[PDB]
Enzyme design. Sequence first.
Site, PDB file in Angstrom:
ATOM      1  N   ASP A  16      29.636  53.863  62.226  1.00  0.00           N
ATOM      2  CA  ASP A  16      30.010  55.292  62.285  1.00  0.00           C
ATOM      3  C   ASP A  16      28.801  56.231  62.442  1.00  0.00           C
ATOM      4  O   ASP A  16      28.919  57.271  63.085  1.00  0.00           O
ATOM      5  CB  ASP A  16      30.748  55.676  61.008  1.00  0.00           C
ATOM      6  CG  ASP A  16      32.135  55.070  60.982  1.00  0.00           C
ATOM      7  OD1 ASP A  16      32.835  55.184  62.036  1.00  0.00           O
ATOM      8  OD2 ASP A  16      32.502  54.498  59.922  1.00  0.00           O
ATOM      9  N   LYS A  31      35.767  45.778  54.137  1.00  0.00           N
ATOM     10  CA  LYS A  31      34.691  46.163  55.032  1.00  0.00           C
ATOM     11  C   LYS A  31      33.594  45.098  55.000  1.00  0.00           C
ATOM     12  O   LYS A  31      33.144  44.670  56.050  1.00  0.00           O
ATOM     13  CB  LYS A  31      34.131  47.545  54.674  1.00  0.00           C
ATOM     14  CG  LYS A  31      35.031  48.710  55.072  1.00  0.00           C
ATOM     15  CD  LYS A  31      35.349  48.732  56.524  1.00  0.00           C
ATOM     16  CE  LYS A  31      35.977  50.018  56.988  1.00  0.00           C
ATOM     17  NZ  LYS A  31      35.972  50.064  58.468  1.00  0.00           N
ATOM     18  N   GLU A  40      30.570  57.351  65.544  1.00  0.00           N
ATOM     19  CA  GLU A  40      32.010  57.534  65.589  1.00  0.00           C
ATOM     20  C   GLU A  40      32.307  58.836  66.343  1.00  0.00           C
ATOM     21  O   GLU A  40      31.582  59.835  66.183  1.00  0.00           O
ATOM     22  CB  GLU A  40      32.605  57.608  64.186  1.00  0.00           C
ATOM     23  CG  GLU A  40      34.120  57.663  64.169  1.00  0.00           C
ATOM     24  CD  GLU A  40      34.846  56.426  64.675  1.00  0.00           C
ATOM     25  OE1 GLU A  40      35.538  56.549  65.722  1.00  0.00           O
ATOM     26  OE2 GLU A  40      34.785  55.361  63.993  1.00  0.00           O
TER      27      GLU A  40
HETATM   28  C1  LIG Z   1      40.238  50.724  61.146  1.00  0.00           C
HETATM   29  C2  LIG Z   1      38.981  51.273  61.551  1.00  0.00           C
HETATM   30  C3  LIG Z   1      38.253  51.940  60.562  1.00  0.00           C
HETATM   31  C4  LIG Z   1      36.994  52.555  60.609  1.00  0.00           C
HETATM   32  O1  LIG Z   1      36.548  53.105  59.421  1.00  0.00           O
HETATM   33  C5  LIG Z   1      36.119  52.699  61.700  1.00  0.00           C
HETATM   34  O2  LIG Z   1      35.081  53.300  61.472  1.00  0.00           O
HETATM   35  C6  LIG Z   1      36.373  52.262  63.008  1.00  0.00           C
HETATM   36  O3  LIG Z   1      35.433  52.533  63.948  1.00  0.00           O
HETATM   37  C7  LIG Z   1      37.468  51.602  63.522  1.00  0.00           C
HETATM   38  C8  LIG Z   1      38.611  51.138  62.893  1.00  0.00           C
HETATM   39  C9  LIG Z   1      39.454  50.416  63.743  1.00  0.00           C
HETATM   40  O4  LIG Z   1      40.541  50.886  64.139  1.00  0.00           O
HETATM   41  O5  LIG Z   1      39.124  49.247  64.058  1.00  0.00           O
HETATM   42 MN   LIG Z   2      34.579  53.778  59.500  1.00  0.00          MN
HETATM   43 MN   LIG Z   3      33.847  53.765  63.188  1.00  0.00          MN
END
Ligand SMILES: Cc1cc(O)c(=O)c(O)cc1C(=O)O
Ligand SMILES: [Mn+2]
Ligand SMILES: [Mn+2]
Length: 178
Positions: free
Chosen positions: A88, A114, A60
């Site tokens: 992440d 999730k 991430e």
């Molecule tokens: C909502 C979202 C949540 C996450 O915890 C994450 O790790 C991610 O990489 C992306 C998104 C997202 O906006 O798809």
């Molecule tokens: Mn995440």
């Molecule tokens: Mn993520």
Amino acid sequence: AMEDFVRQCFNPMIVELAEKAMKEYGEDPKIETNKFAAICTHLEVCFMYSDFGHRFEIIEGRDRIMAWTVVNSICNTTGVEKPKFLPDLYDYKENRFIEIGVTRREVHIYYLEKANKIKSEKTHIHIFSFTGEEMATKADYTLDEESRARIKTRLFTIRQEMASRSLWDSFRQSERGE
Ligand SMILES: Cc1cc(O)c(=O)c(O)cc1C(=O)O
Ligand SMILES: [Mn+2]
Ligand SMILES: [Mn+2]
């Protein structure tokens, strides 16, 4: 107020990474202020989690090219299945990706979202709330109690700073950034 709050309570790199991500997908962080706060919050949690161990690879926060380079590259040297979605972190001790969830709702609820979203992956899931609850795959919480305590403390503090500023009620009902 929410925009000031985020520029003041997260360090400029997190703000800039969040702001950039939003503006590339056409989201104004002056309008989608709850989303802004959530992206910063979740980014900070991912950075904090990595910092409590070179045990973790931070996925991430990187552009998509670099994130997939990091992922494909872990997969080729470990043999582990390629995820469908960018997770992440990678954990080199337990040899698994981690998906990090941060939620204003119940942890079991967001855990389920999730687990359902990435149904066919063998990615470890770790959910944090702004109330100090967590939930993780097989009740395996990956970090030591102190590292997890630091994260929960930081999240509770964001919640309370938001409440000081009368922003918490907007934020917690806003489910965006999740
Ligand atoms: C909502 C979202 C949540 C996450 O915890 C994450 O790790 C991610 O990489 C992306 C998104 C997202 O906006 O798809
Ligand atoms: Mn995440
Ligand atoms: Mn993520």
